[PDB]
Design an enzyme around this catalytic site. Sequence first.
Site: not given
Length: 308
Positions: A231, A272-273, A286
């Site tokens: 992002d 990701l954000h 993970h």
Amino acid sequence: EIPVIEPLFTKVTEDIPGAAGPVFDKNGDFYIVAPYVEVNGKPAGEILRIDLKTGKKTVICKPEVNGYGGIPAGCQCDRDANQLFVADMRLGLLVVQTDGTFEEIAKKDSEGRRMQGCAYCAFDYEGNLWITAPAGEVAPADFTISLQEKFGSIYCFTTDGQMIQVDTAFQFPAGIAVRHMNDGRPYQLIVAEQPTKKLWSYDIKGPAKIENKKVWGHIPGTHKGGAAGMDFDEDNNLLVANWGSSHIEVFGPDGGQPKMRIRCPFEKPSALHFKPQTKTIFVTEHENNAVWKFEWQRNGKKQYCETL
């Protein structure tokens, strides 16, 4: 030497098999996907809401079509309605309502080809959804992934409802992001090709029109994995989860080599954000199949759902 920072990561929730697809909706609620939930050893992936004040998880959607379970893997929120667009490795593109109803958008593409299963997606500011498809054909076909062979594809799902295949022959295409002009016009597409440790760029000439494919950036490391989700921040730096490396890479606006690395307290960041209007980045991973958050230097680039 590329400089490295080690910010404090705070764990939000865990026990999310294959944790991926962090997304905020129009009301600021937070969702993630659990692609690896299984029932009787068959796909039964889930979309979940997390209460950020307590970490409590609520299953929103368990998508299935004619008995074939989904593997939801990446999310974007829509602008004109509060609904999630979900890349699913078995079902392709889903539109998921908060009440748990959902629709599978495309069994075939605009040229009559069987749709491929999808992993990541990104809305441009005009409402076209750019999508990576690292799986083979969607259910009911047998499940296949382009980890070794170059049959992963790229799509643009347009505002007219066309599911347009815009490129092919990727080996596990992963994260995807759109760069916009100050005036709002989309003009560059970035696409991760995970195992090849490459970020590719395209010029965007208009909806579902990309050209001039070139290697744009290089992902460090020889670990199994490579670029996963990505992002932009508000200065158009690209932050890229480097699955297997224990880092998130930071590229400047012109790409190339990372200008900074962010060390994570886990080996396998997957996505990701940003939380809207904050410097807070939510990261799925993970190693522990968990969601964390940390503070970046500046706010995120506004998502489509945040524009008017």
